[PDB]
Amino acid sequence: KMSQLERNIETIINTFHQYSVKLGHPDTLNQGEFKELVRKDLQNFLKKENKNEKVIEHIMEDLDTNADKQLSFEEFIMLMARLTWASHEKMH
């Protein structure tokens, strides 16, 4: 009964939750949680970026629009849209 799109969104949310709850505020990602999520769950889409810890750091800084050193889900979803676009583009 859950649609294809709804399942994909639930996958995103559950993956964010998996890491956000490890430490600190349970609904945001701190830097270490973000790094863990990217290294494991985006090991292909961010393969080049993962090779440099400082690049992963800059991506989180850029996403962290209220500059509180954590990523809310609202902040994080923008990465998801950007990566979906990037994947769409390279399947040309």
Binding site: S3, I9, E10, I12, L42, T84
Partner: protein, 88 residues
């Protein structure tokens, strides 16, 4: 091996493709196509806005179509809303 998260992102592209292929330009979803997408793919709290209201919101360049990057606005808003729900 793509991860489950990566496969979910690629699946989002596939959802869009399901509807852009119905008619016309295959990189465009038109008013009725979006109505069908909202009806099949989105929850009631998203649908209740109205397909025409969503179309006007998503068609940034007002060319009468919703392209993939415009569709991503809906996906972001759906994501943000579902996340709110999952802890409420």
């Amino acid at each position: 091996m793509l991860t489950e998260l990566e496969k979910a992102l690629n699946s989002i592209i596939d959802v869009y493709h399901k509807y852009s292929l119905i008619k016309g330009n295959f990189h465009a979803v038109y008013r009725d196509d979006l109505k069908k997408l909202l009806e099949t793919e989105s929850p009631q709290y998203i649908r209740k806005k109205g397909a025409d209201v969503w179309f006007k919101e998503l068609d940034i360049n007002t060319d009468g179509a919703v392209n993939f990057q415009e569709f991503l606005i809906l996906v972001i808003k759906m994501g943000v809303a579902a996340h709110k729900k999952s802890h409420e």
